[PDB]
């Protein structure tokens, strides 16, 4: 039920998403080990992901959370990188996409830094890098990230070392 619609680079929506990607790159403490060494991206394509069934699934849950949090969904746009991205856009997020060894428990993780999510495109810790060259810092192979609407509701603040 999923349709992907290309956005034009001349579209304000395209440019807005690109700017959020580019502006939230940062340096990482692993020196680039997991996600590669870079200060910016070459954006090749941005597509809108459309699925009526999955959208209604999301809004149904959002309404539950909003009402439980006294009419506040606390909805954000956040990045997510994953080897399972192709499965996520067709079937939706579920337990198969969670991080059991995550700092904050077995749940599904999202980032404000695009470069943080880039560290997970090829798996936890960058896995073995791109399929073709086995290079976590590959500058040739095309990568994909999701930019997702996320309902936080009442969010527990955990300071992290």
């Amino acid at each position: 039920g999923t349709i992907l619609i290309d956005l034009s680079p001349d579209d304000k929506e395209f440019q807005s998403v690109e700017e959020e990607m580019q502006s939230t790159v940062r340096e990482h403490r692993d020196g680039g080990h997991a996600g590669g060494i870079f200060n910016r991206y070459n954006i090749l394509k941005i597509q809108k992901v459309c699925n009526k069934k999955l959208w209604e699934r999301y809004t149904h849950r959002r309404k539950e959370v909003s009402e439980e949090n006294h009419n506040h969904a606390n909805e954000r746009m956040l990045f997510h990188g994953s080897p399972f991205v192709n499965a996520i856009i067709h079937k939706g997020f579920d337990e198969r996409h969670a991080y059991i060894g995550g700092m904050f428990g077995a749940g599904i993780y999202f980032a404000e830094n695009s470069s943080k999510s880039n560290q997970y495109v090829y798996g936890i810790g960058g896995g073995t890098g791109c399929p073709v060259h086995k290079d976590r810092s590959c500058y040739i192979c095309h990568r994909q990230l999701l930019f997702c609407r996320v309902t936080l509701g009442k969010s527990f603040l955990q300071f992290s070392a």
Partner: protein, 48 residues
């Protein structure tokens, strides 16, 4: 097989406290609380 958010809470906000330039990370425990709105295809670029 998957975890639960703190009681009374719907998510966790992981906020880096040492690296002042690092932004937050977030965890949800129900997949229905996220929708994949954009798919972005890209390359990382080698610094000049």
């Amino acid at each position: 097989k998957m975890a639960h958010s703190p009681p009374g809470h719907h998510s966790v906000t992981g906020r880096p406290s040492v690296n002042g330039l690092a932004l937050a990370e977030y965890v949800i425990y129900r997949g229905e609380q996220a929708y994949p709105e954009y798919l972005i295809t890209y390359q990382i670029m080698r610094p000049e």
